[PDB]
Predict the 3D structure of the following.
Amino acid sequence: MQLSHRPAETGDLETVAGFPQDRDELFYCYPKAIWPFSVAQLAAAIAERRGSTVAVHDGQVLGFANFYQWQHGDFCALGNMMVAPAARGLGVARYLIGVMENLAREQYKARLMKISCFNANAAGLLLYTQLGYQPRAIAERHDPDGRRVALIQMDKPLE
């Protein structure tokens, strides 16, 4: 697909806040958020994070991601990774992750990208594996019902 990218803008918030289709999907990309997702919750994340970026195809915002950790010369950690349900499986996240890797390299001089993915999120785990991310550790977390889940902490060298 012909894809472009740019920093997220206020007009994009409504569309992006619509990407998570259920409580599980919101949990996977933003576990601190509370369902239902809202533009206020998205805007709050953007304001306390860095590098909020959208992927665009055929005039439609189809993907979003940002960094929740950024350490110059060291690493960035990617979060809020989400794609419009109708546009999944078409390379939008692959594209946007490539863009985010370049941004980490160029703006943060990062040697490493960290991505953490919840155990139930098979689509995420398989994506990051295909992009060359390796699992490093597993941490315990809790889901919104208080049930115990496993957070798979992965990384990839940059440059």
Observations:
- Strands lie at 4-7, 50-57, 60-71, 75-83, 112-118, 134-142, 148-157.
- The first strand starts at residue 4 and ends at 7.
- The radius of gyration is 15 Å.
